[PDB]
Ligand binder design. Structure first.
Ligand SMILES: [Zn+2]
Ligand SMILES: [Zn+2]
Ligand SMILES: [Zn+2]
Lengths: 187, 121, 121, 186
RNA sequence: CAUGGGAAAUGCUACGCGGUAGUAGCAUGCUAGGAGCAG
């Protein structure tokens, strides 16, 4: 608070005070100078106090509304991300089998658990040990869920290609045993 | 009660009469002191409020009949003190300035801890 | 990460942001370089620019320390103090920094274009 | 806060008021000096307050990013600090088999797999020379990890099955040095 | 050897109130950060 009307009033009051003090006038002159100093101090009170609070409230408003703008921009970004994710996941499912099996439904509404059970084009099987692998996925192909499945690629826990020949009784303890087998819908 | 929320209830004399104080197992407190994640307590000089908080729950071990638990409480007090003073040396010597008022004495006298169980706040 | 002043070999925690290689500089040497060269950006464990929303004050001479973060003059907490003062800049090793006389050559290297023969000479 | 201009003004007021009260001049004089004293104490204590305040904020920032730097360097150096600490505990505990295998690794004789705990479970050790054989592998008896082992097969680098009695000083150069000893506990 | 009214004026001092500013102390409420314990 430097360029204020109360600053000018106090400056001129102090100029009068110092001038009449260096002059060395009567005691009433000194009392008048004291009164002028007072009233100018009164004037300078609000003009150096109110503006500080006004600046503080303006600054907090600026912070708040800047934050509001930032929030809305983030909202737009997230909306765009969500819709593009939807539209990009959607375009890899529409087999004619889906329409086929929805038409046979009495009103369209079918249980969810059957859609991958009938329309999925790839199957992953997780195998704990060789005993289980023996009577489930023996041979290059096998059947499950009333359909034929042909085995394409088999990986171990460390994601390493394992040949089906290597999978045997004697060779069993030489592999990690969350075995993963992925297959295609053989037809 | 023998055990409730993993707190053992002890009856001792506080002030002018007797009240109940729930005290924890000691092994749990010592284990929490010993094993931590990295930097969270790898060097306590970085972070001291951990042991301050730990001690508050170890205070009712002082009034225990067996004295080992009071020994644990005093060990925590001594470690807090040593950490604080060695932090003071490290900070004052090879940097410039630390201290105009201490205000940190309170964290090694049982007066501050006992206020935690005073029936008035 | 701390290092020795490039013009003093004294430990320091200051590097000029505007310098290409950003060498370690003691508070005296760094102050002389910032006050001599147009380089007004200094890199420490954290950048010195104003931490206020939207505010983009970069000149350290115009920046003030506040609530454990740097601030501009406008965005100042009630009790603040300008960073660059007393011929040095606020940081680590400020006491132990010695100060040498190589600001001319350092400024020339940090401001030359290497086109003339002065860089090789 | 003794070397301050406000301290100087307060000291001047103190000296003048002390002179007035010692000499006993008048009432308005001591009132003037008391006013001056209030003014001087006001701007000598208020500025002392906020300067010590700035000093302790300075200390707060110093200690804050001091801890920051300490934390960063510690998390940079963990990868070697842990190894050093482990070796210190090792050389502090010093179990007989522990030191035995430590020295065997030090000279370059280590197991190629996990040490088992049964008389079964063949364990393979790599011995790259013939002196350690005399040190350790005496006949078919292999004393490793404070345990006795019966040597069942020794092979060289080029997978040539190395016979037991064939190994000797004269024929030692004519043998692939990185020998592997496969033995079961005795 | 039987003691003086009203008015205003200028202090000086004391007393009451309010404000402003400044300082310091107290308690609280929110927020943020960091932490610890219990299920
Ligand atoms: Zn620079
Ligand atoms: Zn330097
Ligand atoms: Zn700013």
């Amino acid at each position: 608070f430097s360029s204020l009307p109360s600053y000018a009033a106090f400056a001129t009051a102090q100029e009068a005070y110092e001038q009449a003090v260096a002059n060395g006038d009567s005691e009433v002159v000194l009392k008048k100078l004291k009164k002028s100093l007072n009233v100018a101090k009164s004037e300078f009170d609000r003009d150096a106090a109110m503006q500080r609070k006004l600046e503080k409230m303006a600054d907090q408003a600026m912070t708040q509304m800047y934050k509001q703008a930032r929030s809305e921009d983030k909202r737009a970004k997230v909306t765009s991300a969500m819709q593009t994710m939807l539209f990009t996941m959607l375009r890899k499912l529409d087999n004619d089998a889906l329409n086929n099996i929805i038409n046979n439904a009495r009103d369209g509404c079918v249980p969810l658990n059957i859609i991958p059970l009938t329309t999925a084009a790839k199957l992953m099987v997780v195998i704990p040990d060789y005993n289980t692998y023996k009577n489930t996925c023996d041979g290059t192909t096998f059947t499950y869920a009333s359909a034929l499945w042909e085995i394409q690629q088999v990986v171990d826990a460390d994601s390493k290609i394992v040949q089906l020949s290597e999978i045997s009784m004697d060779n069993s303890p030489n592999l990690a045993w969350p075995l993963i087998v992925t297959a295609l819908r053989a037809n | 009660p023998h055990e409730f929320c993993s707190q053992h209830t002890m009856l001792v004399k506080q002030g002018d009469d007797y009240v109940y104080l729930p005290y924890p197992d000691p092994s749990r407190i010592l284990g929490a002191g010993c094993f931590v994640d990295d930097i969270v307590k790898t060097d306590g000089t970085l972070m001291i409020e951990r042991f301050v908080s730990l001690a508050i729950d170890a205070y009712p071990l002082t009034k225990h009949p067996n004295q080992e638990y009071a020994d644990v409480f005093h060990l925590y007090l001594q470690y807090i003190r040593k950490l604080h003073d060695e932090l003071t040396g490290h900070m004052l010597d090879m940097y410039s300035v630390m201290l105009t008022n201490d205000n940190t004495s309170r964290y090694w006298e049982p007066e501050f801890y006992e206020a935690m169980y005073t029936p008035h706040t | 990460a701390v290092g020795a002043c490039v013009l003093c070999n004294s430990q320091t925690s200051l590097r000029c942001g505007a310098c290409i290689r950003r060498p370690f500089l003691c508070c005296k040497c760094c102050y002389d370089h910032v006050i001599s060269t147009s380089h007004k950006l200094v890199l420490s464990v954290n950048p010195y620019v104003c931490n206020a929303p939207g505010c983009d004050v970069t000149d350290v001479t115009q920046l003030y320390l506040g609530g454990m973060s740097y601030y501009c003059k406008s965005h100042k907490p009630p009790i603040s103090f300008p960073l660059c003062a007393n011929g040095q800049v606020f940081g680590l090793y400020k006491n132990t920094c010695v100060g040498s006389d190589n600001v001319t050559d350092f400024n020339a290297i940090a401001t030359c274009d290497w086109t003339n023969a002065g860089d090789y000479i």
